[PDB]
Design a binder for this molecule. Structure first.
Ligand SMILES: O=[S@](CCCCP(=O)(O)O)c1ccccc1O
Ligand SMILES: O=[S@](CCCCP(=O)(O)O)c1ccccc1O
Ligand SMILES: *Cc1c(COP(=O)(O)O)cnc(C)c1O
Ligand SMILES: *Cc1c(COP(=O)(O)O)cnc(C)c1O
Ligand code: NA
Ligand code: NA
Lengths: 264, 387, 387, 264
């Protein structure tokens, strides 16, 4: 009920949600844990965390490199769940969503993956390469372990898809602002989808892809979305400041404070 | 979907939501085309007058001397381009054209699919983009140069292991943002539906021709048809028309590399673990954690880290049997065909030959009528077997 | 002799007395074989089921766009081995066998004839000996390795210029002392009778097939058939069946190298001087003193320093016309076919293409139905056109 | 009539003819002229001289190299005829035969080549690559300029060939003792041919190919032949002694004296 509570709270405050993305273990475990605490302290409303995968086919260069850096550090899915448990032990109410690729959740059995998420305190799971057509087993397993199955609503979704996404999803609806892959490189009107989803009582929408400036988050809120997700803009700050961990944290702070202010 | 995306437990459509309409579009176009005699006549014309179809079915008398085995080789090495891949790409290019598409995206490891895609695009007026891992481009300058000479844009991918796996990644990344003008010409009978079905249907000539040819020359169907399995296209092209002929054995050969026991191989179907990757549920080269691994083989063309879903299915129900052949075993078959038959086989194809040779040699007195699919020419491998 | 050794003033049997019985033996065997339906059925079987006959006749729509020329290419590049040479060697191997011979002697420059002779011998159980000038062996390691893999003995000749000329010398030296057990498989439609006649007859399929194919597809005979001329085999194979069709033009293309005016070429028929050499009276690359010279061309396969006697004759009476094409001209045709048709032509064949291209481009409004003999595959030349 | 006279003379002496072979210009013009005078002084009855050709297809390695050495010196057919004229101006009665390849005599016109031979004093011409079947124009031109056309009688010649060779040839009949090419490397019974040629009134026979020892020349005479030709054995002495011209001449002398003695 973490997302439910968060959204009610932001609504009472007439505010939009700012949700940053980072890869667990980038550039290292200790520095990553440190990055995440800074993100929260600077104002993040929720978190979208990617576990290192060898073949991230829905991600552009920036996030592709985040996975590579985590791999260089030796981060494994087991170490990720350990990281996830501690993040929750430190922050009791912040919604935590995992960005996963299918093989990592199917690998040891679908049911067992969602059981582990529950145990650690994860709130939602988005599997980037599983369309609604192939979602049944992931959906069912997530629901069985009180985990929200996140579905993606393309900018060109037809009515049948909107109706499906609204019925199946929970936590939040992932509103894609663009075709293509993740990247602050390309920016790329969602009023119709946002209204239709509301009509079908879908979970609150969070706009993702290409969001890298504060004007972009205010625009998302203005269009009717409950918030915005920003990844490459965040990871780029890590990439830029690798030789200065202290500089990194300070720079991350300014950016998410600025980004969060725009949702108010 | 109009067609079943699964072969039992295997197959599916595991791609980001954004790419679903592209797959549904392709499926509809394929169903229509298959019904269209005009499309059919166009495909047949290119196959016959441009590619060299029908290919020969050659009896190998010297190789089987002193045994009760009769061996024939389906001559796909004689197809324009020197490999079976050409059949496939011509049909997929016509499908792209039928859809109003003007661009072609393609992935390649050893270079063959890239060369085939580049030639089909040059002939049919399509703008061709090819992704190749930086490691493969370095290791494959002759094919890169061929692709470029044919007008194709070659793009090195430096991500991950900078090999096939990664080229396959980049292609879908590109396609997710350009599907409206470009068509992704996948290189094997794998990936998300409708690709496994489409590639099979566009590779079906192989077995269909082999049937008529063997019936003419022997008045009997073969006891078994044998084919190497990298991703599964040449194999399924051979098998398809014989699936309902229950007396005909179907044998697929996977690369054993330095030996299964060493872990240095490319045999996911018989020695990997089922996973979900490349828009597909299928056996895969994978770590215990589920991180995708590379396939190894002396033959660069047998490096696809997974296998077509139809093969995984044909195996599970017992219709087809899969085995493996090591690097040294394939080298020997290569050497043998050169000296006794005057034909230089691709090292890929040599894995299939090596198995028919074992079948013979192991039981010399067994009466056996065998057909090996010689999927390609081996001029390519002269230097490799040289050093 | 049973057959006329001359084509007008050209041809003959200029070999040492010791070799005359060997030539008379070969002639008789050829006359018999030609009458023998069993030999004919055997030759046809190998051609069809082993070599890939009939080869395609491909229409090139892209290349001729915007002109009134219709161009077709006889696909000899699709023949087993990648060149027309294969037709010839299979017939000559059966002739050797019919004579009770068990050994094969062969000469090679670029390596193609050697590869073809080695494969025919491997298939038909003959012991193959190949002579190659030391310069050519150094410059042709891929083909030497292919020959060796196929079981043939490769012998470097260091005499003279250590090239084709000299390999041709060594072969006859060997033959003069071993004709009783070995047969000399000459590589072109030249040399002493009966070779020019035999090679033509064993290369005749080319034009015979082209005729039926064009009649089917166009319901008319071609306005002209074009072929490159190194020694003359692919050209005469194309021409033969059309000689009596007076309305069909016959155009042979000789290599112009850096340009006729530079003296750096390989065009003896139109720019050399008649001489007596290689057991033949024919136009030759020669010094003023009569010392035999080398032919030059970007294409290694067009380096025979003379030309077949039938060509010299067809030229003298006006039945066929011969022209030349420079290295740069051939490079351009090579590049063009790759990009517009998706076919990589041998640099040898590219000289013929380059001329059909000139014929088109020079008079775009002339209605012309042309056939170019694509004598071989160009995978071989990728590195050459690369640097 | 030089050969005619020579043979009558050797018959009166019950002797066989010893005929050495060398390439004109090997190793140089001046040294070659010197080699030839030594050959005659040591006892040569006649001479067989080869003019340098680029493609000597009837010759083994030894003579192949003689042509190469002459080429290295720059000897041309024009310089050869100059050499030939001087050899005759010095030696009036010794029969001189040229070993030619077809292109060199056809090159400037067949008739003109034989005219030049006459002018210089050449007695016979053997064209290695012109069989009897192709000899008409060479035969006719030779006869027209009082030059003897030499024909080769293979060790396996049939009656028709023997009859042809006997009718067409003049000077001497070249009796091949072996199949193959020139070379002292391989040695390789001609009684039947020798008798048959005599029957058909052929020109006296000279045995050639593989003759390298004195026992070989006595055997030739014993079989019924009028003499023997020796080439590679001669050229090998030149090859061996290139760095010592003086040593060369001395060694050549001993060999032809030994060889000539065996014909007596
Ligand atoms: O939501 S996560 C991170 C999204 C970052 C978007 P951008 O700001 O970098 O442009 C995610 C969702 C779907 C597919 C891949 C992903 O990594
Ligand atoms: O008579 S000359 C010299 C023959 C030398 C014979 P050998 O002693 O070296 O074995 C000649 C005749 C025919 C063909 C080639 C020739 O050079
Ligand atoms: C392309 C390639 C393969 C790999 O093949 P799949 O047929 O899809 O398994 C096998 N053989 C040859 C000759 C190839 O070029
Ligand atoms: C062998 C070769 C030639 C030289 O040819 P001839 O046909 O005898 O003149 C020409 N083209 C190709 C492709 C060759 O391999
Ligand atoms: Na595989
Ligand atoms: Na020539």
């Amino acid at each position: 009920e973490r997302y439910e509570n968060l959204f009610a709270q932001l609504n009472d405050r007439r505010e939009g949600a700012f949700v940053p993305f980072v890869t667990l273990g980038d550039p290292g475990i200790e520095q990553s844990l440190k990055i995440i605490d800074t993100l929260i302290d600077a104002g993040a409303d929720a978190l979208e965390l990617g576990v290192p995968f060898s073949d991230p086919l829905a991600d552009g260069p920036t996030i592709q490199n985040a996975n590579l850096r985590a791999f260089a550090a030796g981060v494994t899915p087991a170490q990720c769940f350990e990281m996830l448990a501690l993040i929750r032990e430190k922050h009791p109410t912040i919604p935590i969503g995992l960005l996963m690729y299918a093989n990592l959740v199917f690998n040891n059995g679908i049911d067992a993956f969602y059981a582990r998420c529950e145990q650690v305190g994860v709130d939602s799971v988005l599997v980037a390469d599983v369309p609604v057509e192939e979602s049944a087993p992931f959906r069912q397993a997530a629901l069985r372990h009180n985990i929200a199955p996140i579905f993606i609503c393309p900018p060109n979704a037809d009515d049948d898809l909107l109706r499906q996404v609204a019925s199946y999803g929970r936590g939040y609806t992932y509103l894609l602002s663009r075709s293509g892959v993740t990247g602050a490189e390309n920016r790329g009107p969602l009023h119709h989808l946002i209204e239709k989803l509301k009509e079908y009582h879908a979970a609150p929408a969070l706009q993702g892809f290409g969001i890298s400036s504060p004007e972009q988050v205010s625009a998302a809120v203005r269009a009717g979305a409950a918030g915005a997700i920003s990844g490459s803009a965040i990871v780029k700050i890590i990439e830029k400041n690798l030789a200065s961990p202290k500089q990194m944290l300070a720079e991350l702070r300014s950016f998410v404070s600025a980004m969060k202010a725009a949702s108010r | 979907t109009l067609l079943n995306p699964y072969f039992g437990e295997f197959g599916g459509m595991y791609v980001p939501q954004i790419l679903m309409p592209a797959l549904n579009q392709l499926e509809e176009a394929f169903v229509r085309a298959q019904k269209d005699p005009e499309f059919q006549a166009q495909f047949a014309d290119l196959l016959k007058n441009y590619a060299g179809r029908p290919t020969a079915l050659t009896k190998c008398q010297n190789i089987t001397a002193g045994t009760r085995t009769t061996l024939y080789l389906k001559r796909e090495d004689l197809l324009h381009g020197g490999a079976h891949k050409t059949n496939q790409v011509l049909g997929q290019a016509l499908l792209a054209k039928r859809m109003g598409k003007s661009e072609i995206i393609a992935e390649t490891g050893a270079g063959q699919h890239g060369v085939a895609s580049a030639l089909a695009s040059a002939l049919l007026g399509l703008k061709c983009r090819i992704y190749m891992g930086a490691k493969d481009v370095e290791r494959q300058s002759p094919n890169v140069f061929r692709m470029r000479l044919m007008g194709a844009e070659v793009i090195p991918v430096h991500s991950g292991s900078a090999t096939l796996k990664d080229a396959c990644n980049e292609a879908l990344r590109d396609w997710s943002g350009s599907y409206e003008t470009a068509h992704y010409m996948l290189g094997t009978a794998a990936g998300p539906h409708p690709y496994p079905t489409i590639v099979r249907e566009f590779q079906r000539m192989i077995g269909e021709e082999t049937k008529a040819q063997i019936l003419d020359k022997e008045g009997r169907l073969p006891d078994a048809v044998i084919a190497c399995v990298g991703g599964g296209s040449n194999a399924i092209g051979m098998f398809a028309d014989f699936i309902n002929d229950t007396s005909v054995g179907l044998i697929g050969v996977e690369p054993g590399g330095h030996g299964i026991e060493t872990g240095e191989h490319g045999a996911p179907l018989k020695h990997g673990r089922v996973g979900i990757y490349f828009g597909m549920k299928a056996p895969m080269m994978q770590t215990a954690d589920g991180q995708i691994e590379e396939s190894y083989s002396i033959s660069a063309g047998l490096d696809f880290p997974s296998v077509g879903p139809q093969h995984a299915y044909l195996n599970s129900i017992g219709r087809a049997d899969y085995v493996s052949i090591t690097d040294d075993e394939a080298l020997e078959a290569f050497k043998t065909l050169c000296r006794h038959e005057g034909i230089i086989p691709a090292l890929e194809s040599s894995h299939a030959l090596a198995h028919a040779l074992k079948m013979m040699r192991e039981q010399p007195e067994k009466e056996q009528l065998l057909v090996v699919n010689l999927s390609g020419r081996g001029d390519k491998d002269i230097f490799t077997v040289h050093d």
